[PDB]
């Protein structure tokens, strides 16, 4: 409720924070840092399980969805090659921080026994 | 040798928008001589057809009138440009023939005429470029 339904206000704010490169990279870095657990880089996924339970939202998915949509579509409005490279590096770091925080052997042993 | 000048741009011509009558070509008009009556009759027939169509005939009449008044001057300018181009071509051919006859039939020494040779080279350099 940034002062209009929430599903619309959230996407409006995301699109507003998508214009340009500085704010986009800063938001990507902030999200990447927030996705890090407090114990440092296995259980207790680094986010509250009740994140977005009040409103009809899928949790933390909207964030990754918007990040991927940006990285896939709005990479042509960056003229400065350095800014584009920095944005791509930030997106790759975000993807790596999201992937490295997934349990493989745990899920295997779970589905097995 | 001051008649060769491309600054006037006798070849280039500013083409107006011509939102209407654009499809009317100069086929039957054309010795480069574009007759004006061959296009006048065509544009008159087209105006008559448009008037018979009964679709905003009074308002758009001035547009066709001014387009015709521009096309007639366009044709006259094209004819004048063609005439000037052929005249310049004939003059250049005559000058080249004169220069060839002068260079060939010349028993005078060449070291004194080297100055005029270099001057002619300098003058033709931009013409060729």
């Amino acid at each position: 409720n940034p002062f209009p339904g929430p599903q619309e206000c959230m996407e409006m704010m995301f699109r507003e924070f998508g214009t340009g490169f500085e704010q986009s990279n800063a938001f990507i870095q902030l999200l990447t840092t927030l996705l890090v657990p407090p114990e440092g880089l296995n259980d207790s996924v680094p986010f509250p399980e009740w994140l977005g339970s009040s409103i009809r939202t899928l949790g933390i998915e909207p964030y990754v969805d918007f990040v991927f949509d940006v990285f896939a579509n709005r990479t042509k409005d960056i003229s400065d090659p350095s800014q584009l490279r920095i944005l791509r590096l930030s997106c790759l770091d975000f993807v790596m921080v999201c992937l490295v925080t997934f349990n493989e052997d745990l899920i295997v042993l779970g589905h097995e026994s | 040798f001051d008649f060769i000048n491309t600054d006037y741009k006798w070849e280039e011509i500013p083409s107006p928008h011509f939102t209407y009558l654009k499809d009317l070509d100069l086929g039957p008009c054309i010795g480069v001589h574009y007759d004006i009556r061959k296009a006048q009759e065509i544009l008159a027939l087209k105006r008559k057809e448009y008037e018979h169509s009964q679709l905003a005939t009074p308002e758009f009449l001035e547009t066709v009138e001014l387009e015709e008044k521009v096309l007639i001057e366009w044709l006259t300018v094209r004819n004048r440009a063609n005439l000037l181009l052929t005249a310049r071509l004939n003059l250049l051919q005559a000058w080249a023939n004169l220069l060839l006859v002068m260079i060939e039939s010349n028993d005078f020494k060449s070291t004194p005429k080297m100055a005029f040779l270099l001057q002619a080279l300098q003058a033709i350099l931009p013409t060729l470029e």
Binding site: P4, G18, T19, G20, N73, R74, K76, D77 | H17, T19, Y20, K22, D23, Y50, S53, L55, A56, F60
Partner: protein, 316 residues
């Protein structure tokens, strides 16, 4: 048909109208873009894969939400910012300028202008604020604003016979208004009962002022006759996602065209809608087709693949 890639997602495509009594077919079109830091309004000509020439462009602040030609040289755009702008094309030096604008056409803070239609000298707009404006060229303020006309989001508008209009909204209602009316309620509401499916686009039949087509969230095509009660005359299954635009062919309205979020553009051929063969014109790999325009044998459309598709030979 062929594609050209233009480096921006194209929200809107419109053909420039032809000069009265022209025997030529459409060759110049305008585009508006969305989802960039810098969006543009652009004019293009097609030469005789095609050869396209960018004539000129101009930065448009906000996403281009809608776009229509007002006359040969004037283009009206609706912004996500709520601004409505008339751009003027100067053919002599191929530039675009701002002719006039209404920066507070829609507002809450900013409220997107979702739809614009033109009937020179009038311009009608709708927006997410549920406001409906009548503007007139060279008048600084709206002729009339119906404040809080709809409590749902207004998605599109069409003229019926001016000053009568019809709007469609996010709960599937067609509402009829007149700018001479008292109050903020419509004269007539039409809707399909059951699911209140959002309607995203509407077009009036060019010859039958009482007939409109709409496109929905569910991809369906509805035909309505405003004299025939409150439900549609026809409801036809179509696309697999939202239908974004629907257009009757201007000179032969037995043909109608629809485009969708699912990446398709359909040519519907009823040769009458009261009260059918369908050809899908774009390839199977298309992203959302946001917009189309048809004039004579010419079709143009714009997609989220940053592509413009054109044919100048729909019927040959």
């Amino acid at each position: 048909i062929y594609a050209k890639f233009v480096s921006q997602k194209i929200s809107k495509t419109r053909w420039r109208p032809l000069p009265p009594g022209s025997l030529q077919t459409a060759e110049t079109f305008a585009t508006g873009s969305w989802d960039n830091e810098e969006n543009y309004i652009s004019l293009w000509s097609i030469g005789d894969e095609g050869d396209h020439q960018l004539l000129c462009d101009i930065r448009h602040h906000g996403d281009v939400m809608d776009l229509q030609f007002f006359d040969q040289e004037r283009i009206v755009a609706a912004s996500s910012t709520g601004c409505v702008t008339v751009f003027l094309h100067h053919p002599n030096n191929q530039t675009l300028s701002v002719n006039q604008q209404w920066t507070t056409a829609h507002y809450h803070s900013s409220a997107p202008c979702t739809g614009v239609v033109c009937n020179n000298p009038e311009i009608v707009t709708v927006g997410e604020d549920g406001r409906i404006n009548l503007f007139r060229a060279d008048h600084k303020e709206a002729v009339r604003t119906i404040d809080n006309a709809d409590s749902s989001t207004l998605h599109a508008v069409t003229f019926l016979r001016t000053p009568e209009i019809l709007t469609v909204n996010s709960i599937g209602q067609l509402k009829i208004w007149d700018f001479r009316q008292q109050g903020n309620e419509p004269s007539q509401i039409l809707s399909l009962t059951g699911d209140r499916v959002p309607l995203h686009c509407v077009d009036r039949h060019p010859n039958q002022q009482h007939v409109v087509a709409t496109g929905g969230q569910d991809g369906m095509l509805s035909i309505w006759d405003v004299r025939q009660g409150t439900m549609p005359v026809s409801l036809l299954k179509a696309h697999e996602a939202e239908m974004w635009e629907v257009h009757f062919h201007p000179s032969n309205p037995e043909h109608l065209f629809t485009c969708s979020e699912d990446g398709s553009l359909w040519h519907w051929d009823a040769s009458s809608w009261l009260s059918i063969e369908i050809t899908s014109l774009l390839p199977s790999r298309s992203l959302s087709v946001n917009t189309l325009d048809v004039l004579g044998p010419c079709l143009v459309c714009g997609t989220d693949a940053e592509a413009i598709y054109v044919t100048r030979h729909l019927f040959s």
